[PDB]
């Protein structure tokens, strides 16, 4: 019965928005990684002019920024880029604290922990690097790890033996056993290259995605596939709500919303007006971030803008 509506639209960038992270501690600062090499800390404002004010322009990178993630406290940020360098931020000032060199190729995603002290990273070097918060080089986890670009690595906020998820473009979804960083569970079900993984807030489901439009959903406990969903265009981004047991998905022009009890499609999220440029491709969707408010979705577009979504119930 719940719908979305294009509530508001943010303007700060020349380049495409690639990653957005929210935070439950601070419900007015939400952070945007971009391809004009900048990260805008947005002060949420929800006025008539816009839904938010661009507050800080984090500048410490030299190439495209492919990821951003905050700490459990809303004062630190960590953002990979395609310069190869992983840059730790401090949100109070806009000045780095660490600088994590140790990949050769472009770093695609950055693993952040529920413990708030684990940084072990994976790039287009196809290579997992063992570090710490300090940046302490333990070992180069490469031993039967991947064969293509490691696209996204996340952790699980689990009270059990904690589980990482490290996909690739080699159609693999892998489970490395922590306190070993040694590989146990592998998953061969997808076609085409993989692009985004989102883990359940329960601790039992991961949500793979990619080129084929079909999103495998895997039981994390037994290691068995549970739900395949269909696709429109290419999946770019996936997210999990904690309360609603849903799956949101980034289609190219649109956003396909789900319900994971009956594969129930909910709503399609798009606006285009002018039919003169109908031969021009729609601006794609790139990123997706569930806000811990329960009612707010943020997605960034290839037309270098972030558009916000609010839940109209009923």
């Amino acid at each position: 019965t719940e719908q979305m509506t294009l509530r508001g639209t943010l303007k700060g960038h020349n380049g495409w928005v690639t990653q957005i992270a929210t935070t439950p501690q601070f419900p007015d600062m939400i952070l945007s990684a971009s391809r004009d090499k900048t990260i805008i800390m947005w002060k949420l404002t929800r006025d008539e002019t816009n839904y938010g004010i661009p507050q800080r322009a984090l500048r410490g990178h030299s190439h495209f920024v492919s990821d951003v993630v905050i700490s459990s406290d809303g004062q630190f940020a960590l953002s990979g880029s395609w310069d190869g360098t992983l840059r730790l931020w401090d949100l109070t000032t806009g000045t780095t604290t660490r600088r994590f060199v140790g990949h050769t190729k472009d770093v695609l995603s950055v693993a952040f922990s529920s413990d708030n002290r684990q940084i072990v990273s994976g790039s287009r070097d196809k290579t997992i690097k063992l570090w710490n918060t300090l940046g302490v080089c333990k070992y180069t986890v490469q031993d039967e790890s991947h064969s293509e670009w490691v696209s996204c690595v996340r952790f699980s906020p689990n009270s059990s033996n904690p589980i990482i998820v490290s996909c690739g473009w080699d159609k693999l979804v892998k489970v490395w056993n922590l306190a070993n960083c040694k590989l146990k569970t592998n998953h061969i079900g997808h076609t085409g290259y993989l692009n985004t993984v989102t883990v359940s807030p329960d601790g039992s489901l991961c949500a793979s995605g990619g080129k084929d439009g079909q999103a495998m959903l895997w039981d994390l406990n037994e290691g068995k596939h549970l739900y395949t969903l269909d696709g429109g265009d290419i999946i770019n981004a996936l997210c999990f709500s904690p309360n609603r047991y849903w799956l949101c998905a980034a289609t190219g022009p649109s956003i396909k919303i789900w319900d994971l009890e009956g594969k129930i499609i909910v709503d399609e999220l798009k606006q285009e007006v002018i039919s003169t440029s109908s031969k021009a491709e729609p601006p794609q969707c790139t990123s997706l971030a569930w806000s811990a408010d329960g009612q707010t979705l943020f997605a960034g577009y290839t037309d270098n803008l972030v558009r916000v979504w609010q839940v109209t119930i009923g």
Partner: protein, 139 residues
């Protein structure tokens, strides 16, 4: 609490240091109104005469200049005055003030925030200059 950036014309390179101050803009130790080719005095006043004195109030500005010629050093400073207040308003003031004040400058002249890359071409043999050639005679 301090931001130091440069500006640049042909070979001149002027570096302006800004910190939380009380409205002094001195280039090379001496005031803005004192710099000698005063036929171009307003071109050095243009970052002030467009943004007003009130933006240059919690900011102290030293400018350090080398290289170039007279005119090229004048334009190298007005880059660096302007680029610094912009860069000061980024790190210490919100971004919305930075955009507001950056937009006032660029619409007056794009030169104030990005520099000309046009530098002197190499002279080649057979003539006095880069393209020119000597006279020749027939018959």
């Amino acid at each position: 609490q301090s931001v130091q950036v440069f500006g640049r014309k042909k070979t001149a390179t002027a570096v302006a240091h800004c910190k939380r101050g009380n409205g002094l803009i001195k280039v090379n130790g001496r005031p803005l109104e004192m710099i000698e080719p005063r036929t171009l005095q307003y071109k050095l006043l243009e970052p002030v005469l467009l943004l007003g004195k009130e933006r240059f109030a919690g900011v102290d500005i030293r400018v350090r200049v080398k290289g170039g010629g007279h005119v090229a050093q004048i334009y190298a400073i007005r880059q660096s005055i302007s680029k610094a207040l912009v860069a000061y308003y980024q790190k210490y003031v919100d971004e919305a003030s930075k955009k507001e004040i950056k937009d006032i400058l660029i619409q007056y002249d794009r030169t104030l925030l990005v520099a000309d890359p046009r530098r002197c071409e190499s002279k080649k043999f057979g003539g006095p200059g880069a393209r020119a050639r000597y006279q020749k005679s027939y018959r």
